Amino acid sequence: REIHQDWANREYIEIITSSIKKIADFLNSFDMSCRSRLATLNEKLTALERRIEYIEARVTKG
Template sequence: MSRMRHAPAPQSTVQQQIQEDWANREYIEVITTNIKKIADFLNSFDTSCRSRLAMLNEKLTSLERQIEYLEARVTKGETLT
């Protein structure tokens, strides 16, 4: 009879392992979701930064051209007015 009393113990151990497995899976899911959110944010940030840097580059290029033009006029002795 003592053997029958011990039979439920493995079942409770299995149930405990299943519960722990589900808890681990839920934890992994939360971590995975947060990693995806971070990756999405970083990709969005990268796109935004690249766009802003491209606009700044265009403005700088335009300013450089204006400076080169003005320097050429000054070198030739032309008046700037």
Template sequence: MSTQPAHQRPLQQDWANREYIEVITGSIKKITDFLNSFDTSCRSRLATLNQKLTELERRVEYIEARIATNELPTENHLVDDVEIGSENFV
């Protein structure tokens, strides 16, 4: 059996508490770094998606305007103007 002097017990408990706090602090930092990275990634992807949706909305408005003015394009002309099938939207 090891008997510790009374003055060493609080000191050892203090070191144990500090180590525990250090582990918790490190874990919180890792979580924070991940969340910041995730936020940046999501914002970038949403901005890209927003640009693509804006472009599609403009194309739809263009086609609607042409239809409204009875300027019906030929099938090939419509495909050339829109080119929806050739884009990757995700």
């Protein structure tokens, strides 16, 4: 009967959509993590730069 085939097809479509949602959620999580790490890296780099400038300003005359 067509009803059983429709139910199986609705199973298939739902499984695919669930996989899509899994991927999407993972992508969002990845975006959230990567960015925090990048912020930390940027701050570390900024601290190093200023420190280097201070060292340079401290060991040069004019």
